């Protein structure tokens, strides 16, 4: 469950034997996010540090940062996939909200006309495209919480 | 002024004129951290976002994140300049507590590494002029130690 600022995997409602993976793990600023086989004890580019950057409770916004690189979720267009660029931590785009989809999570971009989270497809499979896309009530737009 | 989170320019208690500067403001991995002027407005490579990673009031710990690069405030050494590689969120050198100079009071700021070793954000030498080091040195809750957030 998300309990607030910490380290999680970041895992897709529909395949949780899948997580959020800053693809291939390397130190160069932006790698595309994709999920992938989660593994008995997640690597560190399938981890996220949540941190608060404004607000509390109800308008708390976070940014989510990889661990093993330390670039900032961030989305770009919507309907595209999302990435780790090299940004600053007042992008807008870099900013997300957690909010209960209804246990189970949305991730909402700051920027509400980039959309919230999505797996492309609706995928189930391992190096699926993470978009950041409208919002559609969609189980796809569902995230687990998983502290680490 | 601190409310936990936010953006701030982080001011040198002596040396009110200055804040906390990532020197040459360049996007590359690896800016020592120096006081400078801050000017009419502060440029973004002198603004630093307070980014809470653990716990909460006593116990909060931060990230002190450079607005231009996104790099994290890190010591690296003890009584040695300080700086910002790439480096992890988890990693305990670029983790911060922020904590009242003195109590009864919210104005006033310590900056403490979570590496106890490594000490509190110092101004080197108690230097009042613009371009000083700023150190991880052994904590004394010196004057130079001492630390304002102000913010718009």
Known sequence: ??????????????????????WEGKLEPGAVVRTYT?????????????????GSGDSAEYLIINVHSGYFLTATKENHIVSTPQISPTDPSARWTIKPATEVFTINNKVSELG???????????????????????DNQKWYFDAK
């Open 116 to 138: 919230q989270l999505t797996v492309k497809d609706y995928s189930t499979h391992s190096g699926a495209d993470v978009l950041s896309a409208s919002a559609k009530t969609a």
């Open 38 to 54: 989660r593994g008995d004890k997640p690597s560190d580019n399938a981890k996220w540090q949540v941190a608060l950057v404004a």
């Open 1 to 22: 469950g998300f309990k607030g600022v910490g380290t999680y995997e970041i895992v897709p409602y529909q395949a949780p034997s899948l997580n959020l993976n800053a």
